[PDB]
Amino acid sequence: AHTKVWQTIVAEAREQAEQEPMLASFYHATIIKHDSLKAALSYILANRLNTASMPAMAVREVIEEAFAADPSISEAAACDICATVNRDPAVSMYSMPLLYLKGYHALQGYRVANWLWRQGRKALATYFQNQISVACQVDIHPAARIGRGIMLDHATGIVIGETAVVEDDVSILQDVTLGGTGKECGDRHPKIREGVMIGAGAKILGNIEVGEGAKIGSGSVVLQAVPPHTTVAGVPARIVGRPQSDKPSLDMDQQFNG
Amino acid sequence: AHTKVWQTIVAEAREQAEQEPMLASFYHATIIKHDSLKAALSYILANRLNTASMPAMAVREVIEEAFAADPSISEAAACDICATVNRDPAVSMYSMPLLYLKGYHALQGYRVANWLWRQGRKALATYFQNQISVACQVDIHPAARIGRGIMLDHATGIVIGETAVVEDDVSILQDVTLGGTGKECGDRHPKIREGVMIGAGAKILGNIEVGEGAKIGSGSVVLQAVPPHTTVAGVPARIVGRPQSDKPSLDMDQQFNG
Amino acid sequence: AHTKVWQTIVAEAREQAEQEPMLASFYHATIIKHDSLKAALSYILANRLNTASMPAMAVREVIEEAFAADPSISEAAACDICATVNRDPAVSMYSMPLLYLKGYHALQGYRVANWLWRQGRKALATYFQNQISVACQVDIHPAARIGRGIMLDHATGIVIGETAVVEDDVSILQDVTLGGTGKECGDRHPKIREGVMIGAGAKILGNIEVGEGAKIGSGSVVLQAVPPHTTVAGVPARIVGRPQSDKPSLDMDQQFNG
Amino acid sequence: AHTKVWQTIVAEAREQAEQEPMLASFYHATIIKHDSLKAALSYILANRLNTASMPAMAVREVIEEAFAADPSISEAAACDICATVNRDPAVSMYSMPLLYLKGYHALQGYRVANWLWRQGRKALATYFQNQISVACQVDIHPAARIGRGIMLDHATGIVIGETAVVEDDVSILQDVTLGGTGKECGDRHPKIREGVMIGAGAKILGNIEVGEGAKIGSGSVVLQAVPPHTTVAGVPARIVGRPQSDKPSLDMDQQFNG
Amino acid sequence: AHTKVWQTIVAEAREQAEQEPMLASFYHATIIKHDSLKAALSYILANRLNTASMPAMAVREVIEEAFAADPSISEAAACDICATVNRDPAVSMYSMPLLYLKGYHALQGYRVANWLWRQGRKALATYFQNQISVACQVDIHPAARIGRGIMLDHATGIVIGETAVVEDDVSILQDVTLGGTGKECGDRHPKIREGVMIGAGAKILGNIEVGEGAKIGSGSVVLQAVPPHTTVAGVPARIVGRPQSDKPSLDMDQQFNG
Amino acid sequence: AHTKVWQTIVAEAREQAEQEPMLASFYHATIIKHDSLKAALSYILANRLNTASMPAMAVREVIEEAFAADPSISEAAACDICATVNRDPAVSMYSMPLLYLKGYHALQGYRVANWLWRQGRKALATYFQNQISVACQVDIHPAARIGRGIMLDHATGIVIGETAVVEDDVSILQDVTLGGTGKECGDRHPKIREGVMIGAGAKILGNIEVGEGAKIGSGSVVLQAVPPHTTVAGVPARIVGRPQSDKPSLDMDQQFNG
Numbered sequence A, B, C, D, E, F: 001a002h003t004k005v006w007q008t009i010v011a012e013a014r015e016q017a018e019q020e021p022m023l024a025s026f027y028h029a030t031i032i033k034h035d036s037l038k039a040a041l042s043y044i045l046a047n048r049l050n051t052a053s054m055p056a057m058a059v060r061e062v063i064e065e066a067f068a069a070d071p072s073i074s075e076a077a078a079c080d081i082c083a084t085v086n087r088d089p090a091v092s093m094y095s096m097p098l099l100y101l102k103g104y105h106a107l108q109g110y111r112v113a114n115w116l117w118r119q120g121r122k123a124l125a126t127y128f129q130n131q132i133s134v135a136c137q138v139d140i141h142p143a144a145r146i147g148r149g150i151m152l153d154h155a156t157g158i159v160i161g162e163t164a165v166v167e168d169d170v171s172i173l174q175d176v177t178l179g180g181t182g183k184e185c186g187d188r189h190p191k192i193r194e195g196v197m198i199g200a201g202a203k204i205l206g207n208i209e210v211g212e213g214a215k216i217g218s219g220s221v222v223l224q225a226v227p228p229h230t231t232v233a234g235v236p237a238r239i240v241g242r243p244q245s246d247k248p249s250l251d252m253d254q255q256f257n258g
């Protein structure tokens, strides 16, 4: 996929460039000049991560070093594109998440902060985490554990704490909290299993599990484990049914009768 | 109202300039030196939309182009000022929405992006949409249809999706979603009719009508059509009462069970 | 506390400067160069409040004037750091709130805006409030009355309106609104007494008392006075339980009924 | 010439845009999207004049105001383009002076500052003068009187003082001074008449005439009036020959002893 | 003087502020808000010294530290203002060199680099020296020794090397070199004694003395000691007469018959 | 030389990072992070060439493409560093030209512009040339032919035109012009052969030979071929003597007759 995904992005960019002379250079410098998603993504992220104390051009090298050391980062990033193209009716182009969508930017920003975290460069990981919170309005602790094929749609107000886990193929909307409880260190954030769909505004708190292919109703406050393949809703949330599909993250059906 | 509004804005600006030497030049350059709201607003929005790849000065031209081609836009903008002064007790000056309020900026930004969208300049429309999301923390699809006399108070976390309709004289607080459902293209976002008030944090999802003068309680999750002149609250929302005025957007009474 | 807090911040700063060469100069310029919290905080705050019309270097002088004229401001700033270290398991360094946390930045920003407001410098206070709202995604009316030992964790989407009161030792999470009701001037915003804990996404509206040591459940919509030492939750919120500690803000137990 | 010049500039810009994808947006935003030289030039000069205290976008309005009030300014500007294309073998394109050459920018900058000066806006005139000195390394007093068909080639170190006069059709190379003498106010700068060429590094000092079609050799120091149609060279300069054309500014023959 | 000079600057600034609304805030933030030349000068210099790697706000502290450690720096800076007001017919206001003139900026920038040099902070002094060369087009080695009452008029292209000395009351115009000879370390730059006037373009090379109250002809190349109270001119320079006055720096008479 | 030069630069950099905490990160980001001159030089050059229309991060990719495509460019850059250390008594560190010296920046910038020009990318080469002229105050036509071991000391005002040739081991000071004559295309700029030294402010014009090992006196105006191993000086320049060394550029003896 990752190779075909890149070629399509370049094809789309050539077309957009021709269509919009105000953005022709933007499309060229970010995408068309480049050979790989890595080069395009590092540019775009460095611009979002830009601060007075560490300009974009300096930031880009850090991003490039993470991408070179861990090939899985760029590849997750390509899987995250497909996920959003597939699940979001408002996105029908592969170049869109890469260029435009702050939830996508914050997610790949996270991957870089996480790599830093894992190298022991914790100050710099904290610095990136909090710049992303300011610039993308998404707050993901660098020690969170996040899989691939993830869609963060709209994303304003997403909060993902330190010991949170998000497995492959999860879809999360604006204003979702995967939050902690208490003042003590240790496991205290939710574990979101594969295929889970989380509607706008949901709050999930404590070290609790959300089982495979569960659906979390929009506006839910979840304080206890959610069984696999159930739909929950309410404040606090209770089981209200069973999702129409095996992996409700892929289908994005917001209804809660099930 | 249009020129009374402009003349009041200029008079307030002169007074504020005299009072705050740190901001005299800001008041002069945005307001006092200008003949219309168009020139003031193009300047202020240009600064909000500013990015590395397209600086304010180049952005201003695109804003001015939309204003010159569609006169209703700046008409709507003046109308939105009066909306905010009338409805929001924390705002007693006509220059305040214009100068300061990110909800106001996001909304006028949408008008320009919508104009772009309507000319087939969709990449630039998308560019502006997402820059506004980043800068004003309000995400409105440029294809959404929004009337006039709209107040977006505080505004952080507002999402309004592709096929949404918002009629004249609506009030919408922070963290409100007018959201979609499913992965399929097609009509899938709410239709908010005239006079509706939407309390903070409400989520409304799917292609459902919210009838004229309905009141959506704070924190509500709305999945079904709301009868006109009805008050809904809860997760998921149900009818809890009926508003006394025909247009609760005008009065901003946040109490429900009434 | 004052001196011990600053000396600890300097020691951490020296330690971090040695671990991270990309940030050695950042740590030196903000912290290690300085002999008080005021110098460090004015610098960091100036950068966050930076706008085209009033650049950091200029803003910084305004912040310092406030710090010199009202010594209670830096003291409160010191107290809030301790509050965050003690209460947030993800923060174990005193220099972290100062340097990184937008909720912290926003709160100390409010303190400068409030001082300006108390001087009659209202245009500038409003300028500040709304820049903080855009840059930190926290919107606090400069006329709000806020005590000390306050933690705003994560903070995206926090709204605190004109007549709101927040006493000492309160903890408030992302997406919380202390909001108003109606279109008229007058007292209309919540009074949050000492010891209160407000979970993510809670909406409290109108001139209502939230009693000493109450806990407000995540996602709650509060329309009526909350008795002291009570836990409320729901949409609309009802009594679901009672906290065990006198000041649930100190413990951050998100559980309810609880 | 005026609209042939503009139309040629637009045609060249379209070709350059096609050739250089890195600069397509630059060519479009400065030239291709515009109807006149005025709009192109106001954009380009605004960027050159940009400073912390007055950004390009605000500067553009002042430039456009001068252009609207005094039509001769943009007339002069087009005439200066043709001067540079005709006289300078390294320049074969009409868009080149407009886009690239700091001598050209400094000169059109002076026209705007001179307009300001003539309206009594002397602080802003002085602000622009000195910003041009810093940005273009050309220092022209706004009260100087400069005609049209002027070429400032390379331009670094050009100084032209308060009471200087430069007539139409003059050519002036880098490091040329039209300088004053004494500490007293009053007429004390050269009068350079029509057709004069001034070679690199020439210094001309005091209220002295340089007669029509005189040629000032490179490196000359001129302290006395120069007869029309005369060639001077040396430190201090003396007559060394006579030019064959009536207007050596047109031919740029740098040889002397002839 | 230094006290009266400051009060006049504030009086002038209040007047300019009232005259030019585009610059009212600029005048307020730089001058009117302030109590001393130090505060105004550090602001203005920090803006000129601003680079990506060390923003203005960071630079200002370094400047302020030099001013606090060595009171003679601010006081020389006030004497340099008077010198230029007195000697330059184009400057009749005390606020002008401070705000506008790059030769003045470069000179006071030098004083700060020199203080750094003397403290052993040689990297930072070199960094400031070369930023001033880029931003003001004046290259003064931090180890140069420069007195007070100095006017650098127009200044483009001034070069003052490592072992150069400039005593009190010297006036230097654009494109003057006080330059070195050879490839060996040690004394190799000129010693400009008190009262000396140096015309535009002069080149003075080698460890040679220019005696009190000498006049250096514009465009002179000086390779041997110049006797006190003589006028030299030519390439290479010879004695052509005697200055009309005791201190030709004060009178600025460019004539060279004497 | 290559490897030894880079290793020395890194060692100095480490040393300077420890002496100056304000610059530790600057030294790390430009030098210590990197394993070749190319990475360090591309970064520093990008920042100098930074413009609104093409920011540093984007420019950097263009510089690197040139460095990769033509290995002779970095080699020449290495050689020029050595030339400056050896010849300028005020430079004893190999990292100084790289980091600080605009003449060095401008020359290496020329090398990128020249490469672009040789690819047919002439708009971009012209864009670069003129940005260098504004930012470094050196104006070198991209079609000029320049060798290696070149020192441009101080550099303000240097002009080198289209058909100029500069062979290896040439030293050129501030305010030197290698300039053209006439309005026609064709060979018209000087040929400066190996070993030549050009003193401050010298003007050499027309398609004339400056022979191997010549010395050009400061302030000279050269209109005719200079024999090899000759010293010329004056306006216009005549033979005044003969250099003792074969390559006066290596020794920098400014004396004439000499």
Ligand SMILES: NC(=[NH2+])NCCC[C@H](N)C(=O)O
Pocket (backbone or CB within 6 Å): A051, A052, A053, A054, A126, A127, A128, A129, A130, A131, A132, A134, C047, C048, C099, C100, C101
């Ligand atoms: N130099 C600066 N202004 N840095 C501001 C950003 C610091 C830190 N990355 C944050 O999240 O806020």
Ligand SMILES: NC(=[NH2+])NCCC[C@H](N)C(=O)O
Pocket (backbone or CB within 6 Å): A026, A047, A048, A099, A100, A101, B050, B051, B052, B053, B054, B127, B130, B131, B134
């Ligand atoms: N190349 C750039 N970073 N340009 C400005 C930022 C783009 C902006 N964040 C967007 O959403 O489109």
Ligand SMILES: NC(=[NH2+])NCCC[C@H](N)C(=O)O
Pocket (backbone or CB within 6 Å): B047, B099, B100, B101, C051, C052, C053, C054, C126, C127, C128, C129, C130, C131, C132, C134
């Ligand atoms: N011209 C500007 N710099 N405007 C900045 C944004 C306006 C104002 N600072 C605000 O509250 O949002």
Ligand SMILES: NC(=[NH2+])NCCC[C@H](N)C(=O)O
Pocket (backbone or CB within 6 Å): D050, D051, D052, D053, D054, D127, D130, D131, D134, E026, E047, E048, E099, E100, E101
């Ligand atoms: N406050 C500022 N620095 N504004 C922009 C720079 C001013 C500019 N250098 C001048 O000569 O006037």
Ligand SMILES: NC(=[NH2+])NCCC[C@H](N)C(=O)O
Pocket (backbone or CB within 6 Å): E051, E052, E053, E054, E126, E127, E128, E129, E130, E131, E132, E134, F047, F048, F099, F100, F101
């Ligand atoms: N980070 C930067 N871009 N620094 C550029 C300036 C460096 C050094 N002060 C100089 O004179 O050039």
Ligand SMILES: NC(=[NH2+])NCCC[C@H](N)C(=O)O
Pocket (backbone or CB within 6 Å): D047, D099, D100, D101, F051, F052, F053, F054, F126, F127, F128, F129, F130, F131, F132, F134
């Ligand atoms: N729009 C811009 N960024 N222009 C920058 C100046 C133009 C061009 N870089 C030059 O050679 O001077």
Ligand code: NA
Pocket (backbone or CB within 6 Å): A084, A085, A086, A087, A088, A089, A090, A091, A092
């Ligand atoms: Na899609």
Ligand code: NA
Pocket (backbone or CB within 6 Å): E084, E085, E086, E087, E088, E089, E090, E091, E092
């Ligand atoms: Na004067």
